């Protein structure tokens, strides 16, 4: 999809003012809200929490939330419910769940509006979207899932929520409702075929084939023979640290009458992997009939060769240091300080951006690159270089023994006075060239200002590493000297049409990002 | 009717909670509320005012009322605006909505009352002639879902549907009440009344109209009225002038009423108040009217004779001998067996009353005590002067209550027996002459002239002293009285002395027959 740390969807409340009544309020893709990056995934997402904090109540002011979440800033009663897939409960990077208030009714006759029922959100959010994943093998992920429905006059979902308060009619059915009383979430022990407590998810992720399948079920209250009910299966393709696909409603029958909301397929399943090697994931979807939205989370068993799916780095000038950036496997979306900066609105480019550090100044290259972006980033005053690209699958690395790549680079170097040079297509300005022997796992090339650097390295999988050096001789602006500069890079896009890398040093310094295109 | 100083009727608000909705709330005779005696007729009636004071608001706490009432529209019949005894009108609040969702009650709209009240209900009226009364009238309707009265009230706020149509509504915008001058054929401003009272024939007729805003005849008539006068009261019907024929009826005045009732107030009934409820229970009306701004007959006697100070006060009465009105409260004299005795506490602590007699129907008299004060009382409904019989020899027999003393006091209740208090009278109507005797122990002698339905003369202990079981010498004591009931079957009088022996006496006798 379009990437992000998380998504939230608000409960609906239907207007029943007589004469001005909405017979229905459907859910919409436009209803999804970004959560932003959480400092602590176990806490509620801050933007949406603030909204609910301001929601008026009249008798019970508490915020109720999923049992494994941090009550934080909020209270409860008659409470020890559980919602967990057994053996898969120790989430560290990703949380999904719900939170809500018993909101006061809106009783605004003078605006012909009457609304009543809970107000709240379902959501998932995560930190540390993954830059590496297992290289191969099928891996079981389990966790939880949550839902919120549309509202329609006369509608009920009595199979999942006892409809004494018009759940599904006046306000959304949702998995946190006080009348969701048919799961085993309050029971003290499990039946031998339960996957856990409440609504749980089970996914099989095939890292070898870049795809996944799964099942979303309810673990049923024991009030012979089977004690779970399946509402969806899932199917998705993995691209980098993201996945996209479909959800299939398990019981839609034909003839109905359909006492639950899970009756339509979804063509908008999307999620992503989080953690050092994608050991946790978050996902969401919206049903095609706009009657239900789902979010969820899953993880490998509570306590392997890896492949790198992306590079995203920031090189800070002042201290020549190199930090990893978050990225959602999208070279054209620059993620810094938890905000997303697009990189496409003519070689290179330049612009500034302010969200909602004051503003970000970015110079990005290049116009002919599609899986790789690099340039200059400045906060306001801080200055850095950056590079980010989507690695080519190691199994797609071409075998060709002679391959030339051409492009440019941004440079900042000094043994005394400093030299800085942007990237360019012309003329004697920064230019880069590389010859790669894939068969040999060998790579070499040169960067020239017009004087030059010379790079050499070997090829490990879908990335390379080596060293860069001035002529020394020396450089320009009066001379700078570089020797044994630590060089890191990778190949980007299908069959490695693109490649790029960077180096920092380490009385001469140096920080360089470069990217080249295949001929 | 059943008499009173005034009546009020509250606006209705209809429950429109979905699923627990009232489709309609009709008016009912039982909805009428007594107002009590006002100290100042220009002020709002106190009981109902207190109710409205407690009505909850949320944004506008004011009480709005008819412009001539004591807190630039006008509501008045020109030349007939200076009311002193009787006021009718309305008052209300922009009441907050009731929004009780868990008990399934939603109500919205104005809350308030229409009312009339008066002081000094009349004991005399003009003896004859037709007299024009004009004034104002007011209405409140039922509520019914989907109902509007757009001819009278612009229905932007569901007037007639969620809360009663009423003449004080802010959207009553079709009368001339806000205009600065009058058309040639307007009777005045807003909704006005015009009555012709025929005191000669004891009846009245009238018309209730709206004076229309000018933006072709300028008034619209909604009712005519017809009533019979009995004493200081009147009862009859209202006839809806436009009912239902070729029209779908854009106003609430579509049904007749068989419950028009009202009464006269002031020294000679120069003002009146009235009310009615439509037979279809869709609309209640109250109103008031007066003779133009600036010989009598007496229709009732109602007096209190205070012992301690031998003084005699007029009581209010609504032309009903069996309803004793003291201190603004109504005390019935027949239990819904000669003489009677009982006590009564309203809502002075309690009233103790001894009343006579069981055979009298237009005349009641006896003892009244407050708690401690003690008085005698007499009240009766005079016979029409034109019904005074011409018979030259007529005997009346009965009793009397007596309290007298030149030294020690003598008190004697009334009775049928035996040597106890007894009264006898012979009346020569042809001669306009009356005489009779009261005896305790076998004594007062009374001569008097008849005038209309009343008499006036003297009572003397004669010669000399009386008993005191010490001689009490009362002579030339003024005696006043009347003939009560149709054709003067019952008669009554009283006397106070002086105008070392005192005396206060009420008596009543009944007519005999060959
Ligand atoms: Na986000």
From Swiss-Prot, chain B:
One of its GO terms (cellular component) is cell surface. Residues 23-49, 156-182 are annotated as: Disordered. It is found in: Cell outer membrane; Cell surface. Induction: By iron starvation. It is a lipid-anchor. Keywords: Cell outer membrane, Lipoprotein, Membrane, Palmitate, Receptor, Signal, Virulence. SUPFAM superfamilies: OMPA-like. The keyword Acyltransferase does not apply. Its main location: membrane. Belongs to the TbpB family. Isotype II subfamily. Neisseria acquires iron by extracting it from serum transferrin (TF) in its human host. Acts as a TF receptor and is required for TF utilization. Involved in the initial capture of TF. Helps select only those TF molecules that can be used as an iron source and concentrates them on the cell surface, maintaining the iron-loaded status of the TF C-terminal lobe until its delivery to TbpA. Binds only human holo-transferrin (TF), via the TF C-terminus. Forms a large complex with TbpA and TF. Interacts via its C-terminal domain with Slam1. N.meningitidis cells will only bind to human TF, not bovine or porcine TF, explaining at least in part the bacteria's inability to cause infection in non-human hosts. This is Transferrin-binding protein B. It comes from Neisseria meningitidis serogroup B. The lineage of its organism: Bacteria, Pseudomonadati, Pseudomonadota, Betaproteobacteria, Neisseriales. The gene is tbpB.
